[PDB]
């Protein structure tokens, strides 16, 4: 995808983790209160798959929007998932 494009990924966890760290939420000072990928963990699921990178925004998880989510809410939504997770993203700028 190019920056701004929507894309989706079915991501299988490794070690019960998606392999990303996230930042943001309506209660933070991060751009728009959005949920962004802050880092991709070495050897983790996101890295191995290769579609998600730092700066990508997470819009939804398993069909439910992360809009209006606090940081804690979004993190819980991301964690309260099974072994494979459907994620909807906006491509960031590298």
């Amino acid at each position: 995808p190019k920056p701004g494009d929507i894309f989706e990924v079915e991501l299988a966890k490794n070690d019960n983790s998606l392999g990303i760290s996230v930042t943001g939420g309506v209660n933070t000072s991060v751009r728009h209160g959005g949920i962004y990928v802050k880092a991709v963990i070495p050897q983790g699921a996101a890295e191995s798959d290769g579609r998600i990178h730092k700066g990508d925004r997470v819009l939804a998880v398993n069909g439910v929007s992360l809009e209006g989510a606090t940081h804690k809410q979004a993190v819980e939504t991301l964690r309260n998932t099974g072994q494979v997770v459907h994620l909807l993203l906006e491509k960031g700028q590298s």
């Binding site: 990303i20 760290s21 930042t23 939420g25 933070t28 880092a39 940081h71 993190v75 991301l78 964690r79």
Partner: peptide
């Protein structure tokens, strides 16, 4: 400023 592992 909050960063969390998922």
């Amino acid at each position: 400023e909050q960063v969390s592992a998922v």
